[PDB]
């Protein structure tokens, strides 16, 4: 019942509103008549990996490219290859995943198969190949002509319940032959047996044509193009056939690659009997059974009721039950092998992105272990305590499913501060909270998580001598604070020596420092990358207390940071801007205006991918300015790289 050769992990992707959901639903319908939904067609298992809701979900998208094997790009046949279409395309190119295209909405007014073919050629340099011609134009669209097999199909209704293989109507008869000749030509580019025949004017075997087009599609050399109307149930069954005919099995594509703890890259091969290696890519919380953590098995076998090792951490996780999600029901399975996908129940310490392995297998990691330094802060204020109550709750819960964000209570304001990887991250989170959790609050505008730090050693003291509330308080500390190498964080060294400061308070003076670091002097942002050494001070036999030293520590640090030629530190993003050749130095000047630094340009497909360093504070509304200069065709990804000292000029302003 299992056989790689007949597995087919795909993922539908299209410009928003083009027809991804409908196309997927119609697939499940047709295959159904007998995060990752499975189904069968012509003796083949199709695992429809669920691609991110929108291309902007960059991280999610790249991960889904690695989790799927083949793709079906859906275009609105009346719009052609739109901006996002281009975006997903670049993505598909980046992960070299074979693909086929589907011209959807052929039934709609303005729908044109040639607009999709031409724009695919033009914008994407896709080298499409006409796999079929339509019958009827708009509301009169009624049939599809397979031009590889020279046969037509007409549809009795808009319900996908009356399909009839009629011969090609004389009226498109010539066009079919024209494209069939053209289709044979393309196939000859991948098979000499066919090239010979083509030249001979001979007719190659369907099995021959189908295999060469497949070879080509999987070699990233061509893109079969099919058409239809998802909503009007036309062409979907023909699309299901294309999937099996031309889309790759876990054996047709190069193996996924992973890194061992030794930093050594490795090719993980799709060997069911080899050591297990799987990726968890979507942690969902199903109503009955709790959290389903979806995984892609790359090699080896995942067994039900067993132990897998989480290399992205270091503990044995327990896979309770394994299920395959079908269109209208769940199915418990005894195991999932190489090239397959499913949802494992259990696994409480495993989060999306982690790697699970054989427990007696190499400890490879399919993804980086690094963590997204929170670079965007957004304040939230529940509106009624009742909303406040279910807010921090929704957070605790949502915090486990995704730990790439941190929450804090702003020092002075006392406000709740959610921090993420970028405006978008925070956007989906915030949204998720008002919807899934129906928590309504006032959400502040996103800002960059600046940090503060000194740039020269200082030796200061903190005294807190006061008759506070009747009794006297006395705290005296003398610390030496010096700058730590960027990224070292915090270090407290207690060099105290003669009971000079009663041990009873050492931790208390640290508590004071930790708190006065929650707000630098320049802009009241966190102080980081500093070494603090308490070496002297004094106490009052009766007047001292944990509080006096606590405050004494707070004072000492405010003093130390204000005196050490403090400097503001801003996040520096690593930006990859994929753009059409034409708008080249055009986009390069903008990034330089954003105080950027280009690191080079290495082409992708028929487009140019520019790599650069740009300060996050300069990326606000970049998505817009970009499309403003790449005439809507450009796009880009962005990641945190390092923290940097803001320029002399920049500083004087932020202050
Ligand atoms: N006329 C027509 N409408 C379609 C077709 N496919 C999808 N739609 C409609 O277009 C809208 C967006 O489609 P949907 O699949 O949700 O787009 P998605 O954002 O790509 O998932 C919905 O109103 C669909 O019913 C099609 O072939 N023809
Ligand atoms: Mg949708």
From Swiss-Prot:
GO terms for molecular function: GDP binding; GTP binding; GTPase activity; magnesium ion binding; ribosome binding; translation elongation factor activity. It is found in: Cytoplasm. GTP binds at residues 14-21, 50-54, 104-107. GO terms for cellular component: cytoplasm. Pfam families: EFG_C, EFG_III, EFG_IV, GTP_EFTU, GTP_EFTU_D2. Residues 5-251 form the tr-type G domain. This is Elongation factor G. The keyword GTP-binding applies. Keywords: Cytoplasm, Elongation factor, GTP-binding, Nucleotide-binding, Protein biosynthesis. The gene is fusA. GO terms for biological process: ribosome disassembly; translational elongation. The keyword Protein biosynthesis applies. Its main location: cytoplasm. Belongs to the TRAFAC class translation factor GTPase superfamily. Classic translation factor GTPase family. EF-G/EF-2 subfamily. Catalyzes the GTP-dependent ribosomal translocation step during translation elongation. During this step, the ribosome changes from the pre-translocational (PRE) to the post-translocational (POST) state as the newly formed A-site-bound peptidyl-tRNA and P-site-bound deacylated tRNA move to the P and E sites, respectively. Catalyzes the coordinated movement of the two tRNA molecules, the mRNA and conformational changes in the ribosome.
């Amino acid at each position: 019942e299992y056989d790689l050769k007949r597995l087919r992990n795909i993922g539908i992707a299209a410009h928003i509103d083009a027809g991804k959901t409908t196309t997927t639903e119609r697939i499940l319908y047709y295959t159904g008549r007998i995060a990752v939904t499975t189904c069968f067609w012509k003796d083949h298992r199709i695992n429809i990996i669920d691609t991110p809701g929108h291309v902007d979900f960059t991280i999610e998208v790249e991960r889904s490219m690695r989790v799927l094997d083949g793709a079906i790009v859906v275009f609105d046949s009346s719009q052609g290859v739109e901006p996002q279409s281009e975006t997903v395309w670049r993505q598909a190119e980046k992960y070299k995943v074979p693909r086929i295209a589907f011209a959807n909405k052929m039934d709609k007014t303005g729908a044109d198969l040639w607009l999709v073919i031409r724009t695919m050629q033009e914008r994407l340099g896709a080298r499409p190949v006409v796999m079929q011609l339509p019958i009827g134009r708009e509301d009169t669209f009624s049939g599809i002509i397979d031009v590889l097999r020279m046969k037509a199909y007409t549809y009795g209704n808009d319900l996908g319940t009356d399909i009839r293989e009629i011969p090609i109507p004389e009226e498109y008869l010539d066009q079919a032959r024209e494209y069939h000749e053209k289709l044979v030509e393309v196939a000859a580019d991948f098979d000499e047996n066919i090239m010979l025949k083509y030249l001979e004017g001979e007719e190659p075997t369907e099995e021959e044509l189908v295999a060469a087009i497949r070879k080509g599609t999987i070699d990233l050399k061509i893109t079969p193009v099919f058409l239809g109307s998802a909503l009007k149930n036309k062409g979907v069954q023909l699309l299901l056939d294309a999937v099996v005919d031309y889309l790759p099995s876990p054996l047709d594509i190069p193996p996924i690659k992973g890194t061992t703890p030794e930093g050594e890259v490795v090719e993980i091969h799709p060997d069911p009997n080899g050591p297990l290696a799987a990726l968890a890519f979507k942690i969902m919380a199903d109503p009955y059974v709790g959290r389903l953590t979806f995984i892609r098995v790359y090699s080896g076998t995942l067994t039900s009721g067993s132990y897998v090792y989480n290399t992205t951490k270091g503990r044995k996780e327990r896979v309770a039950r394994l299920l395959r999600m079908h269109a209208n029901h769940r199915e418990e399975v005894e195991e999932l092998k190489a090239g397959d996908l499913g949802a494992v129940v259990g696994l409480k310490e495993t989060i999306t992105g982690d790697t699970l392995v054989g427990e007696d297998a190499p400890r490879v990691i399919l993804e980086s272990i690094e963590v997204p330094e929170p670079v965007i802060d957004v304040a939230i204020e529940p509106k009624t305590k009742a909303d406040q109550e279910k807010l921090s709750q929704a957070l605790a819960r949502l915090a486990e499913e995704d730990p790439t964000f941190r929450v804090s209570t702003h020092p002075e304001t006392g406000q709740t501060i959610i921090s993420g990887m970028g405006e978008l991250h925070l956007e989906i989170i915030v949204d998720r909270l008002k919807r899934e959790f129906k928590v309504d609050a006032n959400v502040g505008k996103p800002q960059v998580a600046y940090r503060e730090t000194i740039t020269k050693p200082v030796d200061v003291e903190g005294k807190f001598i006061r008759q506070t509330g009747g009794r006297g308080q006395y705290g005296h500390v003398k610390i030496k604070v010096e700058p730590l190498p960027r990224g070292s964080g915090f270090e407290f060294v207690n060099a105290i020596v003669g009971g000079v400061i009663p041990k009873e308070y050492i931790p208390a003076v640290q508590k004071g420092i930790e708190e006065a670091m929650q707000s630098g002097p320049l802009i009241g942002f966190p102080v980081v990358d500093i070494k603090v050494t308490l070496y002297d001070g004094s106490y009052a036999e009766v007047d001292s207390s944990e509080m006096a030293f606590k405050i004494a520590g707070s004072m000492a640090i405010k003093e130390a940071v204000q005196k050490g030629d403090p400097v503001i530190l801003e996040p520096i993003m690593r930006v990859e801007v994929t753009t059409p050749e034409e708008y080249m130095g055009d986009v390069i000047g903008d990034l330089n205006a954003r105080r950027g630094q280009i690191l080079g340009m290495e082409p992708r497909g028929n487009a140019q991918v520019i790599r650069a360093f740009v300060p996050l504070a300069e990326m606000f509304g970049y998505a817009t300015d970009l499309r403003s200069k790449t005439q809507g065709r450009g796009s880009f990804v962005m990641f945190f790289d390092h923290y940097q000292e803001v320029p002399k000029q920049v500083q004087e302003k932020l202050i």
